[PDB]
Design a protein around this ligand. Structure first.
Ligand code: ZN
Ligand code: ZN
Lengths: 126, 68, 915, 104
């Protein structure tokens, strides 16, 4: 009754993965500990909230993925738009090749010259 | 066997294109993937050759690759 | 004459077309739900008693309303008259008119019921549960009459299809309001019966499509206030179309009217138990079985099924942002976290973990593993994501940029191709050619492939039928051995699989099987028996051969999921794979006579035998959650002496939260997977087999129940059908004798050979033509209404000559060859597939040569039976492969030398069973 | 990687199609497409020894088909009327010509 208590190939292999998990958790909870989450949870009936609303109501950065222009025009038209009952301000639109697309290029005549899955990064406005 | 020759040549040509780092261009790699897939699925031995010239133009548009 | 019309009009709707005066309008078939001492079933009969006048609306245009005037004996007329005078002042009772007319010399008494539609709820339910696009005239007429579409819609191609033309869902959902009004009228009627002391059975064929009721001929009067309606057959036959027509879609509006805004639910709300109880007590008031909104409180797997079936329907009313892990904020050494302390399933309700430790002290390896696999901290620290490329629910984006994965072409093996060309292959005008390749993929392939989960729709099942099919399936699975095993009895092969997210960052599964002690693994198991661990699944693009340019995907399930599913299911899966001669033939090698023995077992003793096979369109994307849950419960029935009910329920909840409605890491983002199997689980090849047997047993049940029991000439099959209807819709108990009896009937007349998603059936063709066992149209109907897919009869085969076996099984054909005065069945592949796999390699073998020769001898093993083929190019294929393997072995430099033909021959004979 | 490239070229030579051989011969001369050949084609002509051999009047022989020259621009990035090409006044013409045509 030794290999049931102890591991087999510990040999600083168990330590590597536990320190990896530890640093990942402690680098996640550093861009996470804020007061938006406190005011979200502290208004629940018993402190328990669905997970699908945590980013929706506390995230400070949105990313919109847009396939084509008749969706860009219906979704992200302008420099500020509205989503999830909040007001977002656009910044740094990018195309599928990780290249910056200026807002003065997304029209109907220049459409074919854009790598089309466009990624719009927006910040939550107050 | 002029169809199996064309389909194997299509495989080799997309291999060399991929090695030339054209998947680092979304639009171009999408066009080349479409050409290669339709050449592989083709059943007529002349539109396969049409798509083949269209796909080889991609390789030899890059002003210099080998062409000694 | 016309006097009969002047009288049947009475004092309402003086404008009636003379559509009948004798016993006319009797040239029609109508669906009936009949049960008496001679017949029992839900089938189409020839109703010939009526005389149906049709009202003509103002301006001489005909309107959908009829006066159905029947001729009754005096006793039944008096009885029905009294019961109507009781139930008269209820709004859900069609008006009746009782009169007498002088035909020749006797005042014959007639009963004319007023303003009925042309069809009834039974006609609608039968049209949708016995669908056949050859003759769907009743369905077309209903959909047109009630303004769901127009007459020209059906000129469209594949208008009935679900996966092509998915607008048929919008065309069906226009009957939802009508179906919901029918449910409300039914509850009104049941109340009016109870408060009047009227005992009777409610059958669908007594409710017109407006909602009214009639035909009080079998009710009996009791003491008032203590009536009791019987609604089992009604509600259970109606159930499958409540989700197909989205009947409750008006329950998510402000005041349950489709012309008002949506209910803005609270965003922090997740319980919904009182709303579910309100919905049940509103629509199914008299369904006299206890409904538990949170299946945690269930009693047995049958109760879990019964109540998850209701939660599936009631959960389409609630906001989709309220399902999924329920996070809480815990403290570790003072630093706060967010961790899942529960879950909210669409099917199982709210589940709460029992071992939650607020204000922790430290993190050991087990709890570190749990917290790292938990998607709470991953989705709470990532950006909000709005993905307009899919309709699936998106949770969060874990990065600052989306990742676009592409797939490469294959590696051309030009030496082999030149060898084949010099031998004489691929010549123009040949039957063997290249048809299988590696199709390259562009960036929009991962998400375009993930978006197929839109084919998984919420579907309610006929529960009184499922609760019997599950007993027959568990009869199919009762020669095995299951139970939990300790962590030191698990044998794990392929220790280099994907460890899911976020573990694939630090190693394969070998890392976590070598880091965790046996005690740690046992503790993690015993933990999952009391808590829910939601995990994340990685979705990658596969690099494999196909004849279609579609993108093939692969899934990596978390290590903390696979590690415990192994201890739960390893014993049963080993027992299934190590047994020969059963229905579910998994893990039975086709060599040394395995194919011949499999076939001789399928053919076992069926009398007039025909072979049949079918396929499931979009099986893994479209398998319903109720059926996946049923499969997992059937598999978990082996744990009766080691796991109590709480342990088995929490194992079911973990399995759901992990491989049914998991979160999927696609690209660099988290999406919500609606349902369907995961190709990366070790259990899906067996869950698919349970699902396969379920659908086959269901097709048999429907074929036996939908046949006119008066024309069945066998007084044994008549009693079998009668008792089948009883055991389904009466007799809430489980009848073990009849379950054994029906299982024996099936095994005698419908023999199956099942592997995951693949089946071959040997059936009595006489019974199948009489309608006593399942044909292929019965499978088409069952798939349509229980899988939301349309199965074309162009992908289903049938074989009348058994000496040439199944046309296709596990991608193998069968040929009857001679092996020393003993004719045996041998499996041969597609020569195009063999040649393709030979010419295109994966660049792992283009470097070293021993792996190349291993690949080529495996191919020449799979391509030996072709030598016995009558076609000559097929034999030339194997000769080519052998010449090439000899060339390779000579380039690198008796029955175990892989370069002579007798190493391969011995692989297909049972006299040398050595591996 | 030149192994894969010489494999590709030996296979292309084996195919022996005249369209492929034509575009390969032009690419070896210097006459090169600037975009995927359309089944709006723009092509670089090096000099007139290559121009006269292919382009006659307005009509363009490439990929063994016919194209109607819609716009020709010399290296100087300025429109040129294609009725100025000569065999003695050939110096002053900016000689890498981008010729844009459509398939007739
Ligand atoms: Zn229950
Ligand atoms: Zn157990």
């Amino acid at each position: 009754m030794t290999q049931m208590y102890k591991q087999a190939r510990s040999e600083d292999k168990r330590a590597k993965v536990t320190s990896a998990m530890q640093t990942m958790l402690f680098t996640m909870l550093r861009k996470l500990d804020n007061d938006a989450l406190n005011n979200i949870i502290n208004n629940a009936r018993d402190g328990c909230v669905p997970l699908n609303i945590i980013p929706l109501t506390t995230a400070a950065k949105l990313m919109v993925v847009i396939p084509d222009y008749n969706t860009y025009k219906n979704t992200c038209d302008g420099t500020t738009f509205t989503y999830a009952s909040a007001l977002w301000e656009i910044q740094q639109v990018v195309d599928a090749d990780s290249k910056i697309v200026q807002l003065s290029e997304i029209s109907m005549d220049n459409s074919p010259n854009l790598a089309w899955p466009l990624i719009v990064t927006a910040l939550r406005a107050n | 066997s002029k169809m199996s020759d064309v389909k194997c040549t299509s495989v080799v040509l997309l291999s060399v294109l991929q090695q030339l780092r054209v998947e680092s261009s979304s639009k171009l790699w999408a066009q080349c993937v479409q050409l290669h897939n339709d050449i592989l699925l083709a059943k007529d031995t002349t539109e396969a050759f049409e798509k083949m010239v269209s796909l080889l133009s991609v390789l030899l548009s890059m002003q210099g690759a080998v062409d000694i | 004459a016309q006097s009969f019309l002047n009288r049947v009009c009475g004092v309402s709707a003086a404008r009636l077309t003379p559509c009948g005066t004798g016993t006319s309008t009797d040239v029609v078939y109508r669906a009936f739900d009949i049960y008496n001492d001679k017949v029992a079933g839900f089938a189409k009969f020839l109703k010939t008693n009526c005389c149906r006048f049709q009202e003509k609306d103002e301006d001489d245009n005909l309107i959908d309303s009829y006066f159905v005037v029947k001729r009754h004996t005096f006793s039944n007329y008096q009885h029905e008259e009294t019961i109507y005078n009781l139930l008269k002042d209820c709004p859900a009772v069609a008006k009746h008119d009782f009169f007498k007319f002088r035909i020749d010399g006797d005042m014959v008494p007639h009963i004319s019921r007023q303003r009925l539609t042309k069809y009834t709820m039974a006609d609608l339910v039968y049209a949708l549960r016995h669908f056949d696009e050859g003759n769907c005239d009743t369905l077309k007429e209903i959909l047109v009459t009630y303004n769901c579409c127009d007459d020209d819609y059906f000129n469209k191609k594949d208008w009935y299809d679900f996966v092509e033309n998915p607008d048929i869902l919008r065309v069906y959902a226009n009957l939802g309001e009508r179906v919901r009004q029918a449910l409300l009228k039914t509850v009104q009627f049941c109340d009016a019966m109870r408060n009047a002391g009227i005992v009777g059975v409610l059958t669908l064929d007594n409710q017109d499509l407006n909602g009214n009721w009639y035909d009080f001929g079998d009710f009996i009067q009791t003491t008032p206030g203590s009536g009791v309606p019987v609604v089992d057959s009604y509600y259970s036959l109606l159930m499958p179309i409540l989700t197909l027509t989205r009947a409750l879609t008006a329950e998510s509006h402000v005041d349950t009217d489709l012309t008002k805004p949506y209910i803005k639910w609270d965003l922090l709300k997740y319980d919904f138990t009182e709303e579910r109880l309100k919905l049940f007590d509103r629509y199914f008031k008299y369904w006299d079985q206890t409904y538990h909104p949170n299946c945690v409180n269930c009693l047995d797997d049958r109760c879990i099924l019964h109540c998850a079936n209701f939660n599936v329907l009631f959960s389409t009313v609630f906001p989709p942002t309220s399902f999924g892990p329920l996070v809480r904020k815990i403290f570790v050494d003072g630093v706060p976290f967010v961790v899942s302390t529960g879950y909210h399933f669409r099917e199982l309700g709210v589940v709460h973990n029992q071992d939650v430790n607020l204000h922790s002290s430290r993190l050991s390896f087990k709890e570190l593993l749990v917290y790292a696999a938990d998607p709470a901290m991953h989705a709470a620290s990532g950006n909000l994501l709005l993905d307009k490329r899919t309709t699936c629910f998106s949770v969060a984006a874990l990065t600052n940029n989306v990742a676009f994965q592409t797939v490469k072409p294959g590696n051309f093996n030009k030496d082999f191709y030149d060898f084949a060309v010099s031998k004489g292959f691929f010549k123009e005008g040949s039957s063997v050619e290249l048809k299988h390749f590696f199709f390259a993929q562009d960036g929009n392939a991962a998400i375009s492939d993930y978006d197929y989960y839109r084919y998984n729709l919420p579907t309610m099942c006929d529960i009184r039928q499922l609760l019997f099919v599950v007993e027959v399936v568990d009869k199919y699975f009762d020669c095995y051995d299951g139970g939990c095993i300790n962590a030191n009895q698990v044998i794990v092969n392929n220790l280099d699989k994907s460890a899911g997210f976020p573990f694939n960052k630090w190693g394969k599964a070998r890392l976590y099987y070598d880091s965790m002690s046996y005690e740690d693994q046992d503790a993690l198991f015993a933990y999952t028996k009391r808590n829910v661990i939601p995990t994340i699944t990685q979705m990658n693009l596969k690099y494999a051969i196909s004849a279609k340019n579609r993108a093939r995907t692969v899934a990596g399930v978390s290590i903390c999921s696979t590690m415990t599913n192994r201890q739960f299911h390893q014993k049963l899966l080993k027992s299934i794979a190590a047994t020969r001669g059963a229905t579910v033939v998994i893990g039975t090698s086709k060599f040394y006579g395995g194919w011949h023995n499999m076939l001789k077992t399928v053919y076992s003793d069926v009398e007039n035998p025909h072979l049949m096979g079918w396929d499931y369109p979009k099986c893994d994307r479209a398998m319903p959650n109720m059926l996946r849950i049923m499969a997992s419960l059937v598999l978990a029935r082996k744990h009766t002496t080691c796991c109590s009910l709480s342990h088995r329920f929490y194992r079911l909840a973990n399995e759901c939260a992990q491989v049914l409605s998991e979160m999927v890491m696609c690209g660099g983002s988290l999406y919500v997977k609606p349902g369907g199997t995961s190709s990366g689980d070790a259990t899906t090849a067996y869950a698919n087999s349970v699902f396969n047997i379920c659908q086959a047993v269901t097709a048999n049940v429907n074929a036996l129940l939908s046949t006119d029991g008066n024309k069945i000439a066998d007084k044994y099959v008549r009693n079998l059908q009668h008792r089948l209807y009883e055991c389904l819709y009466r007799n809430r108990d489980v009848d073990t004798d009849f379950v054994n009896e029906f299982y024996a009937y099936l095994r005698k007349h419908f023999s199956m050979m099942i592997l995951s998603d693949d089946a071959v059936v040997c059936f009595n063709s006489t019974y199948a033509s009489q309608g006593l066992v399942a044909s292929i149209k019965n499978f088409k109907s069952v798939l349509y209404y229980q899988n939301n897919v349309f199965m074309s009869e162009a992908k289903c085969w049938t074989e009348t000559d058994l000496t040439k076996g199944p046309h296709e099984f596990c991608s193998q054909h069968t040929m009857l060859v001679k092996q020393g005065d003993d004719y045996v069945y041998l499996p041969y592949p597609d020569p195009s597939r063999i040649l393709g796999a030979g010419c295109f390699v994966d660049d792992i073998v283009k470097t070293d040569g021993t792996l190349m020769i291993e690949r080529f001898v495996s191919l020449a093993i799979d391509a030996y039976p072709l030598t016995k083929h009558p076609n000559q190019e097929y034999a030339d294929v194997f000769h080519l492969y052998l010449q090439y393997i000899r060339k390779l072995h000579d380039e690198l430099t008796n029955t175990s030398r892989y370069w002579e033909p007798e190493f391969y021959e011995a692989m297909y004979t049972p006299h040398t069973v050595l591996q």
